[PDB]
Design a protein around this ligand. Structure first.
Ligand SMILES: *[C@@H]1O[C@H](CO)[C@@H](O)[C@H](O)[C@H]1NC(C)=O
Ligand SMILES: C[N+](C)(C)CCCC=O
Length: 361
């Protein structure tokens, strides 16, 4: 199985124990660690943080302890636009400049491959993403001739049917990519006016205003569109999403006034790290959505949809049953990477729960 795990550049700046550098990562926890995100500047891949060259080195030193570990660098992300990516991919000359720049930069910084994180191609972009993926893979095949193991190419792909149909020619890109990480954890957000889970495995009996908004639907769709099982990697979040409740109702359908208050460490309304959530659960009431097979918890006017050891194992059993290539984790710095928040003295509880299921029968 693969266990693809993202590390984010910006996690280093969090206050106190929220601070996460790549030497916090257990070299043997994942099979591939993806460093997020690289910029494109002068139409060439580039660093983002002032000290990315140092942290790339820190990450890459993990292979001293675990020489089988693979690393990739993800270009794109939310701060980088969609529109910035569109401009590069849609013109043959910009596209070539970009593609040429990638292998030398990766080899300089000790990465084994590139992850494409264009978030996200519009309907005018679908055909240009196809061309980008094909041409980038061709450049990697060419570069392998110089004697070093061929660079890997992956892509992060959103899990909503509408976004997939808008931007991605899944049958074509899957031919050239070594794996596709499906982002099966953005199925609900504060843009809705109610509580709901963003990473349910199934729809649940609840109701079907929108069937589609669940991981099973997305995995089945990707396979239907021609992504081989052996290239499809299912995303599992270590963060949860929070809401501020509008009423005392806490239940399926409960109204919401906006995202939840910011976490003490992650400081972003509407999201919490798992370590923050372990703290939140003290004094909270816990519930599971039985049909959707994922938990939520509530305290005061705050309501948090999240994943725990049981729901992540359950997702790992599911993707092994569908014979997928493995799991992707967003993100290592949002698991309890210190191991000191969740009452069990165990670093990366959620990621090691996934790893242990994948390792069994
Ligand atoms: C990314 O590249 C753009 C385009 O050159 C540049 O304007 C921007 O400052 C870069 N961002 C960072 C954080 O380096
Ligand atoms: C917004 N945070 C807290 C940086 C996390 C954003 C999703 C980050 O990984």
């Amino acid at each position: 199985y693969k266990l693809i795990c993202y590390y984010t550049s910006w996690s280093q700046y969090r206050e106190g124990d929220g601070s996460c550098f790549p030497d916090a990562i257990d070299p043997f926890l994942c099979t591939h660690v993806i460093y997020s995100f690289a910029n494109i500047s002068n139409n060439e891949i580039d660093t983002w943080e002032w000290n990315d060259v140092t942290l790339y080195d820190t990450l890459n030193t993990l292979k001293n302890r675990n020489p089988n570990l693979k690393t990739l660098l993800s270009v794109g992300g939310w701060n980088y636009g969609s529109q910035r990516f569109s401009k590069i991919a849609s013109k043959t000359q910009s596209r070539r400049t970009f593609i040429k720049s990638v292998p030398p930069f990766l080899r300089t910084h000790g990465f084994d491959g590139l992850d494409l994180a264009w978030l996200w191609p519009g309907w005018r972009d679908k055909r240009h993403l196809t061309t980008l993926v094909k041409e980038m893979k061709a450049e990697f095949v060419r570069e392998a001739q110089a004697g070093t193991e061929q660079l890997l190419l992956s892509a992060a792909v959103t899990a909503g049917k509408i976004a997939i149909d808008r931007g991605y020619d899944i049958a074509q890109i899957s031919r050239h990519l070594d794996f596709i990480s499906l982002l099966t954890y953005d199925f609900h957000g504060a843009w809705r006016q109610t509580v709901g889970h963003h990473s349910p495995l199934f729809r649940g009996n609840e109701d079907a205003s929108s069937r589609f908004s669940n991981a099973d639907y997305a995995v089945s769709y990707m396979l239907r569109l021609g992504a081989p099982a052996n290239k499809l990697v299912m995303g599992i979040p270590t963060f949860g999403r929070s809401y501020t409740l509008a009423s005392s109702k806490t239940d399926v359908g409960a109204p919401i006034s906006g995202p939840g208050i910011p976490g003490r460490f992650t400081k972003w309304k509407g999201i919490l790290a798992y370590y923050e959530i372990c703290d939140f659960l003290h004094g909270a009431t816990t519930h599971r959505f039985r049909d959707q097979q994922v938990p939520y918890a509530t305290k005061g006017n705050q309501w948090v949809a999240y994943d725990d050891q049981e729901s992540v194992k359950n997702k790992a059993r599911y993707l092994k049953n569908r014979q997928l290539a493995g799991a992707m984790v967003w993100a290592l710095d949002l698991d309890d990477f210190r191991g000191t928040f969740c009452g069990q003295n165990l670093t990366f509880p959620l990621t090691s729960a996934i790893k242990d299921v994948l390792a069994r029968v």
